[PDB]
Amino acid sequence: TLLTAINERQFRNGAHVEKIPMRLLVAASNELPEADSSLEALYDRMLIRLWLDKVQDKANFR
Amino acid sequence: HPHLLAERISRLSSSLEKGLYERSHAIRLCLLAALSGESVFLLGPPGIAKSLIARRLKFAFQNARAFEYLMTRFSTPEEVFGPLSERLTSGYLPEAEIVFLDEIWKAGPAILNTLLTAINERQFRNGAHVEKIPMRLLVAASNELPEADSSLEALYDRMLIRLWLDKVQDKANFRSMLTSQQDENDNPVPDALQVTDEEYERWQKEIGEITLPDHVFELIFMLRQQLDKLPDAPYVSDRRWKKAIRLLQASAFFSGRSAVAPVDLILLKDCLWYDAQSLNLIQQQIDVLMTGHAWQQQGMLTRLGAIVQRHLQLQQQQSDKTALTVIRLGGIFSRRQQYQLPVNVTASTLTLLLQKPLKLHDMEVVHISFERSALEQWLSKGGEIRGKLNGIGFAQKLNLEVDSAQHLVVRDVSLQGSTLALPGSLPGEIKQQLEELESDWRKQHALFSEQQKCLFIPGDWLGRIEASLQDVGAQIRQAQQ
Numbered sequence: 001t002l003l004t005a006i007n008e009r010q011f012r013n014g015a016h017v018e019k020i021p022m023r024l025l026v027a028a029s030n031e032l033p034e035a036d037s038s039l040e041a042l043y044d045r046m047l048i049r050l051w052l053d054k055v056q057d058k059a060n061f062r
Numbered sequence: 063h064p065h066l067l068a069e070r071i072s073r074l075s076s077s078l079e080k081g082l083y084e085r086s087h088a089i090r091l092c093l094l095a096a097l098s099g100e101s102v103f104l105l106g107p108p109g110i111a112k113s114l115i116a117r118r119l120k121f122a123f124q125n126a127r128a129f130e131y132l133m134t135r136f137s138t139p140e141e142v143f144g145p146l147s148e149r150l151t152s153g154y155l156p157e158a159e160i161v162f163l164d165e166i167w168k169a170g171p172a173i174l175n176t177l178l179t180a181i182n183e184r185q186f187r188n189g190a191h192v193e194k195i196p197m198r199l200l201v202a203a204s205n206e207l208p209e210a211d212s213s214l215e216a217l218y219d220r221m222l223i224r225l226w227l228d229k230v231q232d233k234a235n236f237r238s239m240l241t242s243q244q245d246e247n248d249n250p251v252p253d254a255l256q257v258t259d260e261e262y263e264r265w266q267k268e269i270g271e272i273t274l275p276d277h278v279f280e281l282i283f284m285l286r287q288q289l290d291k292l293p294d295a296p297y298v299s300d301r302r303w304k305k306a307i308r309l310l311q312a313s314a315f316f317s318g319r320s321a322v323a324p325v326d327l328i329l330l331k332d333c334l335w336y337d338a339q340s341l342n343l344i345q346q347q348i349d350v351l352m353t354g355h356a357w358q359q360q361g362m363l364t365r366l367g368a369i370v371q372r373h374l375q376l377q378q379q380q381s382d383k384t385a386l387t388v389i390r391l392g393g394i395f396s397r398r399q400q401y402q403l404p405v406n407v408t409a410s411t412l413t414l415l416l417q418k419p420l421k422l423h424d425m426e427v428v429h430i431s432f433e434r435s436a437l438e439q440w441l442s443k444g445g446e447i448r449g450k451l452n453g454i455g456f457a458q459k460l461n462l463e464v465d466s467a468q469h470l471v472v473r474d475v476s477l478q479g480s481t482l483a484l485p486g487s488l489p490g491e492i493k494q495q496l497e498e499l500e501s502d503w504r505k506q507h508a509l510f511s512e513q514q515k516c517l518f519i520p521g522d523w524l525g526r527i528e529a530s531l532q533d534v535g536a537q538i539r540q541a542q543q
């Protein structure tokens with residue numbers, strides 16, 4: 001159901017369908033999906049892929 | 063009435079290609095299976111508009127419901143065919159015109175077993191009583207190939223059309239595709255081109271009523287027997303051959319024809335193959351038959367050679383009327399220089415016949431084609447000369463020498479003399495056989511010019527059929543000179 005909200009921008013509301021005014025979709029995790037699984041469909045559709053981490057500067061941590 | 067149907071079909075797929083570049087063969091193939099009750103298989107990397115073609119075919123019908131689902135390793139039949147309470151199937155698969163199942167080579171045994179009955183019987187086990195399924199088009203895409211010894215081979219053998227989609231390759235088609243403003247989720251098909259539910263049920267009866275000409279049966283049986291002899295050729299079962307006629311008969315029905323046309327054999331290049339090894343063999347075996355036995359291309363080549371062989375036989379038999387006189391020249395030279403005929407002969411690769419045939423290089427010959435650039439040096443300076451046999455092969459060395467009556471004598475291994483002669487300035491028997499073969503080439507070319515406008519035919523394949531037919535007509539025109 002999450003694949004139809006990005007391409008069609010709609011949702012199956014029982015009978016009729018309605019548009020979804022989704023302006024930004026953010027998804028965070030910790031690990032990477034498998035190379036041969038069904039989770040690769042959502043990863044291939046996500047445009048921006050950022051790799052965040054902890055702070056490294058001493059002045060920024062204080 | 064039948065001629066006006068080709069205009070609506072050509073205009074329906076034209077609006078569907080708006081926004082999809084390098085996908086003309088993928089849209090017209092899915093449209094033919096949607097109006098005939100067949101399936102289509104897609105193979106390629108994820109991200110080549112493999113799901114947009116499934117959602118675009120629902121706009122051709124007035125009442126069509128799409129269904130996009132991704133088959134997982136832990137998928138349950140309650141999420142695909144609707145969950146039970148007697149089964150809540152509101153908008154799923156039993157009541158869907160076009161269904162799309164991505165990555166089908168990883169489902170469970172319960173979903174694969176129920177999917178086989180929805181194609182052959184077109185029904186579904188809804189608890190107790192069964193109900194029909196109005197599935198007009200079934201498309202399944204993935205990325206890899208199933209195992210050779212698994213239960214997933216049953217669904218692959220039942221899928222007729224098998225397309226191998228890939229990324230774009232043309233640079234001009236990539237600029238317009240990368241910058242496209244056409245909405246892929248809108249409705250770009252007019253209401254006047256959308257078919258109704260009554261027209262779909264009526265076309266299913268007229269598809270099986272297409273007559274099968276005797277000329278088309280000779281090409282299907284020839285292609286089937288050619289694959290049974292090659293060990294690397296893919297095995298084609300009887301189910302694949304029977305289902306291919308339903309897509310071939312409907313190809314001519316929507317193009318303004320009443321019988322099966324020989325041009326519909328190109329659609330078999332995306333049905334007989336099954337893996338990467340069968341893709342290069344199926345497209346090669348069909349291209350030979352399409353440019354050889356389809357429009358009597360190879361059948362007229364072997365018949366034209368008999369006329370050329372008969373013309374050379376009648377020329378060498380009447381060679382006793384025209385001889386070969388070599389004129390002499392004066393000047394101051396240590397060797398006896400000879401000169402050829404002036405305006406009587408001007409060709410470079412001219413041919414010279416002979417009377418009594420000899421055995422040269424363990425083979426027979428009827429005419430020796432010499433070169434005008436090398437004949438002037440041998441008749442003046444001397445030495446050795448070369449020449450091919452029967453106008454073919456390499457220029458082999460011969461035992462050419464001068465005679466006492468200014469003639470050319472060709473000797474072999476038994477010291478046998480043979481006086482050469484040039485062909486004189488068309489018999490009635492050769493002109494009669496050449497006129498009958500030329501009329502058959504014009505009749506075969508007229509049939510191709512009346513059926514090449516089919517929508518389900520690739521554009522790059524038209525350049526090879528026209529080049530093959532022009533090569534036969536260019537060879538028959540040279541013999542009548």
Ligand SMILES: Nc1ncnc2c1ncn2[C@@H]1O[C@H](COP(=O)(O)OP(=O)(O)O)[C@@H](O)[C@H]1O
Pocket residue numbers: 081082083084085107108109110111112113114229230239246
């Ligand atoms: N070869 C192509 N030509 C034109 N558009 C394309 C092509 N491939 C993808 N697209 C566009 O990319 C969008 C997303 O495609 P997507 O559904 O991810 O393809 P797939 O189902 O193969 O992963 C579609 O709206 C389609 O218009």
